[model samples]
Target chain A: VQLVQSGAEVKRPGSSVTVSCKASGGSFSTYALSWVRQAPGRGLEWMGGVIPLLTITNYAPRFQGRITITADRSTSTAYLELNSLRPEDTAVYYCAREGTTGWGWLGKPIGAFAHWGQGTLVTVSSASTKGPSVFPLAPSGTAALGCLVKDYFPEPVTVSWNSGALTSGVHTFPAVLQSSGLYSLSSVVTVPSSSLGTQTYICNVNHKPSNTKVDKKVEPK
Target chain B: EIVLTQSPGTQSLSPGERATLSCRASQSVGNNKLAWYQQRPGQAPRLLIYGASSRPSGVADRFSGSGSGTDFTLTISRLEPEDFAVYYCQQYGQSLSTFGQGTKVEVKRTVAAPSVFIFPPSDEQLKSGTASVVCLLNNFYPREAKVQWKVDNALQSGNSQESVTEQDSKDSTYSLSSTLTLSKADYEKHKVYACEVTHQGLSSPVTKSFNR
Candidate 1:
């Protein structure tokens, strides 16, 4: 169950294309992340509003230093970077979900937005360097697969399954967003399955977090 | 205690298109003072600011505002295709006054909804040229909203629309009435005089005129 929810970022005209929209079922700051910028081609550019539930974000002086919305909500997802990414940030890149009712009372803050994460097209190119590549981890247990990309710069990917003979575990090291250089690493391996051998338990992606060394395998019970 | 609801329930501005007005606050007016109103489709309801970042004297600096304190922002910088109206936002710091249940300020192309608009000139139309109309409902929004002058069809009972020395640049200039005067030949014989304003998830009625 992953969810980048949508994606298509180019960013090169000036270089700056951040497209993120994530939500893993429930519970992540309870919901609060806004960054609207539609109308680059005449459709979307809210370009003003941010509040990842506070950490020091309050821009709209036309998007203060440009744009940078972030959220972790315990690894749930919510990010929309667009610094210097002109051509007006290119349109599309929604990750809305904040408007049970707010703007004033003592709780203030209301421009209105109720659930939205069906947009992904961030193109601003001019040369291109390295900004979109980190989404390949969901081979755990094999019954929870349907995540094309929902945001995961967490590196340490884990998943154990070697039920017929192929037990392995010991890998962790992958997590790099360097703000945007975006990089993630993870490891924990256990492989063995080629017609039954007996002794299973697996999880891969262990490139060296000290290399505990539990790697074992023997599939087919 | 945070309740700001607005989602296609009602509020259809057209003029230049691009208006997503939504004010939520049932218990959080933090910086206290959020203002946004331009009822020009039928007159009577103009303030536009109180504390969401100043701009009330003449209001029309394009109408720009940014969120502050408890989170607020009302932008109308440019919808002026004649400003075809209907936008609500008021929260005197939350404690009583509240408005945001109606938003249908339409006018992207279909124009022809003028029925009332005239203010401060009541001393017999400033003595003669003939003209006197003012009506600014206290903080309008359905707690029983009203403003008169239907003439020909009958129903002309008015006398208070403001002008008793009420000036509150920031809360302090007491007075009483909001406004509703009419003279100047009882306002030119009333051939189709109008000024109908109602609120509560509004959708139609917001007339404004005094001619033809």
Candidate 2:
């Protein structure tokens, strides 16, 4: 019984991707196919498993709706269709015949996953960056100016403000994902209201693939 | 001649609220007589709506009966102090005398949360080969609590028996018990057994397990 991974794939960071596992001698007709994932620099995690004959599937709680495991009995091939994608999803995936220890359920597992395919690398890479819009909170001695950064990807980013030695009033909020599969974040910095009319407030949004930087000078109302 | 269907073992409402009860027939009741009765604890059942819409001499007008053929409704226009009791809807078309399993109307309240305790089958019963675990909910208000059994963390349904809820006249509070019958072999093979109770006064359901 030989298990073989389909191949390496570099899917664009987006909504969907599927990879396959082929079984040669003893087909998927009698065994359950277990899919395990090894992320960059991480241990293997159970993603999903399927008993092809009975059409029964088990999945990790976190990946319940995000992924699926299915098999083709005619070709003795198993597949994993992951629903959503991001850079964090890049991993080397492996397929194995589900083994014993009575983790054995519907399809009786033979001793300790006798056949394991060489892992398939699923590398993901992509990002979209747009700059932040700055708005000032007015009518106060010390004004709070917020920077809203929108439409970005692979959320490794940071925000910075140049307030000329004032550090206590700058605050950064968590990033939020928008409906269009992009990200949004907002951070606020407070500087002397008197400085806004003459001094320029610059917000630097550092992101993957590029850096989004903006400068806003307040015109007092 | 036809059979009938009923649902919801109990109904909860306030004294001034209107209560509509349903009894579905397999076929037309047409002109055949349909009756509704109020049966309280320790007393014979009292006829409320008999012969379709006609009421007994002493019964109040708050109780009304409507609907005909295949579907019949027994509506308590207004529930009163004595109206909170078990109601039986009977069909005279069959003539063999069959009634719904029965539905009880009880006042909704928050007097006290049910305190649950579980009693596992005794060792003597274990020696005899089969025994039942008992789950008791005592001194609860409104008599509106539910009990379900769990074995090894999974819910086990339709294999347990629940006792009639009884009231303590001394305090007017209610108490009930549920039993799960299992063979000693079944008990020893899978050890975790629990009873979960949901009641009016509790923010969340409470569970008691039989430790072995």
Candidate 3:
């Protein structure tokens, strides 16, 4: 349960930014890790894979030549690197310990992901993060959104957008989940009020048990 | 792509009471896929849905699902008193499949009726015949469910029982299988073979009937 993996945070654009997620509180030597991505404007993408114990890694052809997801179970850490970072890749990153039924101590049958990381946001922009911002709920437009949960956390959180339209565009921003149980957040992306007025904007968060296939979207009643 | 997330923990329940579940995706996942699973005490998980609404063959219609795009719902219309166990959801979109945090549903961690029962072939023989049939324990809880053979619908006291391991596939539910052997003469005499399962909860027993 311990976030055993962490690395130096780097700033780059098309260049690669390698980050590691380490696990503690248990022995990951026999377990495998699965990496996923949620792009800037879209949902989730199953990038590729790696098995720390076996030292075997595979990637989606789209990422085959560009990205690398590797890990060292002996060190309790997994790594994710995007060769050529693009605005499309500027989203959240997560690491989940792949379940093993038994292929051997080192051989793991990648099954359901039992655990996940809190997640990290990579802003493709040149502006550096000074600090997280907390904004009040807006009366109109999609500005009442809250913090985005990290890649892996025990419980999935929700994102709720405000109701109404603004003379400006819909305001959408980013947020983060901290270990302290508190979240640091951002502001809304301004959408043109006139064109956005009656549309249904939503706040989405992961919901499970019912079926962990999608995020729950809540709109103002 | 639709992103599914579960509570990462199980919610206990009392028999006869209904359980409400929620399934959501990151964005609008359209009319893709949504399904529920019951992993009661120690038994393997069972399929509740496929292709968004169709129930897996052999599943009770008691379980139902409803939702669109990013928000979906799964409701156990009625708690059949026998339906006490943990539940989970599976999604089959994007590419690799994922499951929701599993939810354990049970009155207590006790031996209950078998959630899913399977029957092996009747009149098994031990000759070059090598008569072998399998009994499937579709849904049990905590992964502690076992399969036992019956001579005449009565538990075969002298028969040996072996527990099989369960596994989850991207598009499949938790599955486990147990096999029983009987001489062809024995099976011929008793064309009826039954598989009884005892979940780690409840007081009643669940049985699967078969004829060969």
TM-score of chain B, per candidate? 0.22, 0.63, 0.45
Q: How would you encode candidate 1's per-residue C-alpha lDDT over B1-212 as one tens digit per residue?
A: 23444344344344455555556665677665666655442123344555666654445776766666555666675575545545656554432233555454443222222222322332323354434343322222222344555546576663433222112222221121223335566655556655565544345666554444
Cα-based TM-score, every candidate: 0.23, 0.35, 0.35
Where does candidate 1 chain A have its weakest 10-residue lDDT segment? Answer: A142-151
The CAPRI quality class of candidate 3 comes to: incorrect
CA lDDT, every prediction?
A: 0.43, 0.65, 0.50
Using lDDT as the measure, name the better of candidate 1 and candidate 2: 2
TM-score of chain A of 2: 0.52
Cα displacement (Å) at residue B186, model 3: 95
Question: CAPRI verdict on model 2?
Answer: incorrect
Question: lDDT tens digits, residues A106-207, model 1?
Answer: 233333333456667565534323322212222222111101111132222343333323332222222322323323322223233231233333432232
Minimal lDDT window, size 10, model 3 chain B: B165-174
Query: Model 3, B1-212: lDDT tens per residue?
Result: 34576553545554566766777666665346555656543232444665556554456887877777776677777677557656666664544455555554544333323334343332212343434444444333455565577757766754333433222222112334444545566666776677766565546555666666
The local distance difference test score of model 3 is: 0.50
Query: What C-alpha lDDT, on a 0 to 100 scale, does residue A55 get in candidate 3?
Result: 77
A57 Cα displacement, candidate 2 (Å)? 61
Off by over 4 Å in 3: A3-10, A100-110, A129-221, B1-212
